[PDB]
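Q: A reviewer asked whether we had any structural model of the full assembly, not just the individual parts. We don't, so I'm hoping you can provide one. Inputs are below.
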Amino acid sequence: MLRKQARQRRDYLYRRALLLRDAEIAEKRAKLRAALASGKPLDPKIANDKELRKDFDYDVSRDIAKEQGEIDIDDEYSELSGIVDPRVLVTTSRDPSSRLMAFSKEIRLMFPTAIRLNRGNLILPDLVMSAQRERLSDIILLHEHRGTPTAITISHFPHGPTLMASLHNVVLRADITVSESYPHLIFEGFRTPLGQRVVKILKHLFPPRDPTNNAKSGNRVITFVNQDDCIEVRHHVYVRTNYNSVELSEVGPRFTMRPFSITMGTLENKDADVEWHLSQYTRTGRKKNYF
Amino acid sequence: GTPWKIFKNTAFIKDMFNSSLEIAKFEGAAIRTVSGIRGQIKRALSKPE
Amino acid sequence: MSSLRHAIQRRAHKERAQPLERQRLGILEKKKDYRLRARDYKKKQAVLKSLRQKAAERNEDEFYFGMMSRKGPGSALTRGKGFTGTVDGDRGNKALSVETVRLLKTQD
Amino acid sequence: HVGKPVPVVTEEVSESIEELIKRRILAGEFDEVLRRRPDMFADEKLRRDEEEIKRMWKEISAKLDALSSWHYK
Amino acid sequence: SVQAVQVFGKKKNATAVARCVQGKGLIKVNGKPLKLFAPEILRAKLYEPILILGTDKFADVDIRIRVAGGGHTSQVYAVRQAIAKSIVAYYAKYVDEHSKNLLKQELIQFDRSLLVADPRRCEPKK
Amino acid sequence: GVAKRTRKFATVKRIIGKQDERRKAEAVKKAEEEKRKKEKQAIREVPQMPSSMFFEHNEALVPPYNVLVDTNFLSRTVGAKLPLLESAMDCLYASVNIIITSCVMAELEKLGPRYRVALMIARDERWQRLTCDHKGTYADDCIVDRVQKHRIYIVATNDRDLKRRIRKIPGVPIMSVQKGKYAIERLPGA
Amino acid sequence: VRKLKYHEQKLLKKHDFINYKSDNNHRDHDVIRRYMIQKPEDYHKYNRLCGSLRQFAHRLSLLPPDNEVRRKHETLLLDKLYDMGILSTKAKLSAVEHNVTVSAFARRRLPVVMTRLRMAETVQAATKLIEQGHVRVGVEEVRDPAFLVTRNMEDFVTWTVGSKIKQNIMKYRDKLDDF
Amino acid sequence: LALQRLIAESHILSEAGANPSHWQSSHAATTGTNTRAFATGRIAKKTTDMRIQALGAKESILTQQKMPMNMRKGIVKHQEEKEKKRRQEARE
Amino acid sequence: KRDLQLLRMRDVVAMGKQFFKKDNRKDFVPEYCQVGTIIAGATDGVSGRLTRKERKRTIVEEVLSSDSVSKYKRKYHEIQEHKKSGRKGYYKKLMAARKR
Amino acid sequence: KPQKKETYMQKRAVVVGREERKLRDLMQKLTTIRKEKIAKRKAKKEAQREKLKKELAEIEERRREKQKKEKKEFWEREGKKRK
Ligand SMILES: [Zn+2]
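A: Here is a predicted structure for the entire assembly that you could use as a starting point for your response.
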């Protein structure tokens, strides 16, 4: 088990390193193909590279599959992209408060296949060992300041990218029961490849959908939208009262979220390579949305 | 002002502002250490006014 | 240009020492001493990072033939108060037989 | 100042979010991940070449599973 | 060329070694004897393998126990596991193989936690 | 009868394998002999900085000036119609003895009877025939070997190859022919 | 056979008793000696499986490159041979064109993969241990030094049950237990 | 474009089998090197090599670069003897 | 072996008054050596001759017999005063200065 | 580990007097002055080496500009004279 997932971490990082080694031969090969097809200008280093022609003729068709969009990108997600139903735990900090366990109640109440554990006293490599053995395909962590929560840490398994994010502007459930259908994800403003990574680690966190009639069937919508790299999520229930009108309602936690870390490797990997963090205390770090 | 208590990245510093009102006026400010070490005023410590 | 620069435009600027109260506390680190403790700490944490990746990514069923001629680091229970995390080494001392100690004490 | 401030969400911002929701619902498009079916997978010269390559892959793939001593997929 | 057996015992964090050799009946836990360790109300749980197995099984051996970590309770369970595994292991290697199986039967018919420690994981319910 | 002789365990067949003698190449073996002779014979070769040099000034060249003549120079002065002793004499203002190596007369004779005038002006019996002994009959390496050894001579050449080759070694004059007269590069006299 | 003279060598230029051109620069037992292959017949067995596998890659790249039998047998060849363990990435058919190799088979053997897992120090020590029978792959005590280990069976390989080597490991680490 | 590939690649596409009237080409349709089960991609290799030679290449993969000089003089001598016989048979 | 060490270290002995051929080989002990003494030049017997209190037993005893031994110790305490710069007595003085 | 027990081979040895004591002291003081000596000498050779490679880097920048100007003027010449 542990030897399996350790060797899968190591083999995955090795194949990613071979992507970074073959980037230049990939762009050179794409200019060779596109300049075979389109027209006569071609660079004489490309035309003179004699290994590129043989390895070209062996490796044309997979770049055709990329341009067509056939094959899937090697990732911590697309091994089990939309077939498995991702079981997602939610936990808190060590001695949670009344407001914090209520907030845990409403965010497990936000995801459909989300189980909730009481914290108790559970050593964190037993969190990753426990979710490692009972295949919780995502856990999320919670942190408070005086019950009013201040962080979440989504982190998924066997070795997937954890995201650490602070937490602002939180309104809980007000005075008064919410459905659990497979929800409607919308994502607005994720323009960059870091936005594409955070959008992938949020859109593989929910149960997938059979693709026939997702456009009409279902009454629950979950909305993520970022202004100034501080994403938003609201939780609304809707009845489509016409063919050209719809009535929404705020159903749950009014939520905004400032991501400050995206670390590849799980919640225990406090030594593994980050891909992103807030660059505060640089001098032009407060003038950029994504990086 | 002078570092009063030194944690790893935070630091309680002293002898600089007179009151929590002044801290709150400067409660997002870019503060700097003459080692060339930037920092941010976060929040007024309560009892050591 | 360097020829188009004066001699007051080449004056060294003076580093300022501490106040006489803080002279108890020590040297004011300005940029040099900060870079010395920063590069030293980066080097230490780089070595500790490599060693944590060793201890995490070690193979429990590993076999070396030096284990038949060395004594391992043990644990806090097999070593007790005399536990550091390290493997002891050889000072070259040895239990010396009784004939040669008779030789050394005729000499003594 | 250091870093970014975090904005206070007001009613115009929240109702503009509601307008984004209503535009996506009515003009229904979503980023829900869709369920893939798991088991997804002259012309005489092309098909003669294809049948010879299928014969080659049955022979070679059997020999590879035999070298791995039936620890294949 | 001595008759020596090393044996461990476990609980939450208390780990205990016990070395059992050819002796004359003593059991000493961290130097002090066995009837002196582990404050009074749990020494019956210390004695449980002795008065299951009978002292006649123990009048030929010496058991030396070092205990580290944990609280008092976990040190008690680590000690009694080290006692039981110590005598089963000594009778495994030095006296005949039938008597091992008889001692395993007595200890297992009482409680298997004298031999196999089962540490608790958690239950993420479905 | 007797307990039989135990077999070994990890026995492999005896195959010839890399890094033998009889498989290894003869030029690699001569490279090993060269590395051993130059490892046993412990010599730190520092050639002496030549006598009569003061920081890239040869004071050892003084009139009567010696001048090694190249095939380039004999061709371009019989082409520029400019007599050799009188115009070297006229560009240095000093009595010269011109020296013509057997590599240089070898290369002019290898050039065919188009250049029989340049050969017949190159074999002037006034001049010092400087007999060389090396296998090549290649004039540019003969000249840089000779100048590198003694560093007295003035080298009369015109090619960018050899002029650029002996701008690298200090304190040597380069005599060229700029179509009406000769030229001297780095002799700090006239 | 003395070192031949000048005239005898140039009368014998092609001559050598040791290397022939048919001997393939003795690449056979460079790989045999390097990876402890106890039989040259097993070298050439792996060689011909390399040859058939690599010409299957050749005739995959001889198809027109939009074809579906190509776009499926590429993924099954690469995924089969990767999860086998011989290749190291599954995103390049040129990697089968020049990166499948009887040295890659031979380094996917058992004493090399447990040397690489540091079950021993060298391939000779690990080979000797797996001919004395201390190892297992999975549940079965493997005593074959040519047992090809696949990529997920490079996790379930350890010492057998009553192993003196394993008592030396727990004995070194000062944590054994005679129970 | 594609017509430059037509007129340029005509001795190879015509060398395969594609003219049943012509004697060299329909001899080459059942010669054996195109009745093997993999031929259109061999000729696709040669024509993509001709395309890169049109796109600014001086050397082909297809040629053997190193030969023992009597094989080589035999082959180049053989090509020159064939073309000399063809030009002495172009006086008909 | 002390004398051989002194012969790889003769540049420090003549303290700047005489510099030598820099001979940095790793193993300073040669394979073949033979410890001799100068006998006599038949032109120099007045000043070019050691006396009874100077025909000492080793080269190291000659260097110890010569002058500049307090110069050796002086340069040695320049070096020790620079190698006790900020090492541990310094930081121990800082800790006492703060805790006082 | 440091040994806190004086063993017998340490309780056995010969206490050596003033002459060999001072030969040891002189030999040590010479060896420390040698170590600081070579530390200085190789510090300054390292600095002069860094100046040498610095200005060699600048002169190879200027050699690169000679390469680009020469090839650019060439392909002006034959680049015009092929057309
Ligand atoms: Zn010559």
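A: Points you may want to mention in the reply: Residues F 101, 103, 132, 134, 142 surround zinc ion (CB under 6 Å). Helices of chain I lie at 2-8, 10-13, 59-65, 69-83, 89-99.
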